[PDB]
């Protein structure tokens, strides 16, 4: 073990990868959510390029 | 360090001495109202009910102040504090014993702001002397500052999200100073360029140009309807 790296949503290593609309709706996740952000301490953070 | 504490902006000299935060202030959105005289501002009920003006009890005005103290702080045209002459103050939000509600001559009553009170009305990018003018208060239902449009030019106001500040003078001397120096009608002509700063703007100007054309004719009904709106009318219908 080294440490924990946060994962931006809908990445290839995110749990919401390849899941269908029904799959996300069963998870209380909006299928229209673009992903593309991190969740740090329960807050949604985004990196400005 | 100590130098940083008073160096420049936000330091002691510029952030606490040349300019400070003040009591008896209000800040809301402004909206138009063409039914107000140019020296009036309409304030909502809650803002008036929250700010107080201290008034000295005298035999001339002891009955009215007694009634105001009776109304308490709940109903709007009431008072908030009653100050004895020995500095002691009584709060009217705690429904104290009626013996305390009794007031004599040398007392002060902090009554809610009512119609006719003098306030300084300001817009924050204060450039010239016409950005801090004095108005008379009028209480109005909804929750926005309302002001006649002729004065939107000195303030450079816009009615599209603009906010303006209201300061309530707290003493008779200060109120008299505002009334005698900085009332709106006294600032019509500016010393900057010896020309008016308030004029006729927008659709009032458009309609006055369309209204004084040669071929504009009015029948008696519409003439009477218009004459209903002259405050200075002498009641004599002109010969057609």
């Amino acid at each position: 073990f080294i440490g924990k790296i946060p994962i931006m949503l809908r990445s290839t290593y995110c749990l919401l990868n390849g899941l269908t609309d029904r799959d996300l709706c069963e998870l209380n996740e909006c299928p229209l959510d673009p992903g593309g952000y991190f969740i740090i301490n329960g807050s949604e953070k985004v990196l400005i390029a | 360090s100590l130098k940083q504490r008073l160096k420049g902006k936000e330091g002691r000299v510029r952030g606490n001495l040349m300019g400070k935060r003040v009591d008896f202030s209000a800040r809301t959105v402004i909206t138009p109202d063409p039914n107000l005289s140019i020296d009036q501002v309409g304030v909502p009920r809650s803002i008036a009910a929250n700010m107080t003006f201290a008034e000295i009890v005298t035999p001339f005005n002891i009955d009215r102040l007694q009634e105001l103290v009776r109304r308490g702080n709940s109903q709007y045209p009431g008072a908030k504090y009653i100050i004895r002459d020995n500095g002691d103050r009584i709060d009217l939000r705690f429904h104290p014993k009626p013996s305390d509600l009794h007031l004599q001559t040398g007392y002060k009553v902090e009554r809610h702001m009512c119609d006719g009170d003098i306030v300084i009305f300001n817009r924050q990018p204060t450039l010239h002397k016409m950005s801090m003018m004095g108005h008379r208060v009028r209480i109005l239902p909804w929750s926005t500052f309302r002001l006649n449009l002729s004065v939107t030019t000195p303030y450079n106001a816009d009615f599209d999200g603009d906010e303006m500040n209201l300061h309530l003078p707290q003493s008779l001397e200060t109120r008299a100073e505002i009334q005698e120096l900085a009332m709106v009608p006294r600032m019509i002509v500016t010393p900057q360029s010896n020309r008016p700063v308030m004029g006729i703007v927008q659709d009032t100007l458009t309609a006055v140009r369309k209204f004084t054309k040669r071929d504009v004719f009015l029948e008696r009904g519409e003439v009477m309807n218009l004459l209903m709106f002259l405050s200075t009318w002498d009641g004599k219908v002109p010969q057609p």
Binding site: - | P44, G221, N225
Partner: protein, 115 residues
């Protein structure tokens, strides 16, 4: 937050009078009727009826502020005809007209409903 209740537009409270008369002092035979909790619905019809009367020199009305619910009607009549008389006659004429229109509408509907 500062929203007035809706019924404020048409409900009077304690100490509030429906109509008040004041004698205008600028000219003789003129009066100001200050009606509370009314709007253009009554002002316009009363003004028009007063304008029909040939003994009324002036008849106008106004609403001082759209957020305060009252109107002022100014009526100036010729001498030997008090403006109060003109006002009450105008009201009676409106009542007569409305009753006549109501009965004629009833008759016309009855005719239409049976071919």
């Amino acid at each position: 937050m500062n929203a007035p209740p809706a019924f404020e537009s048409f409900l009077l409270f304690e100490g509030e009078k429906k109509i008040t008369i004041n004698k205008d002092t600028k000219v003789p035979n003129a009066c100001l009727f200050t009606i509370n909790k009314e709007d253009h619905t009554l002002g316009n019809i009363i003004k028009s009826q007063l304008l029909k009367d040939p003994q009324v020199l002036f008849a106008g009305y106004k609403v001082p502020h759209p957020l305060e619910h009252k109107i002022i009607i100014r009526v100036q009549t010729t001498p030997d005809y008090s403006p109060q008389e003109a006002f009450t006659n105008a009201i009676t004429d409106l009542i007569s007209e409305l009753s006549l229109l109501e009965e004629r509408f009833r008759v016309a509907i009855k005719d239409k409903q049976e071919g």
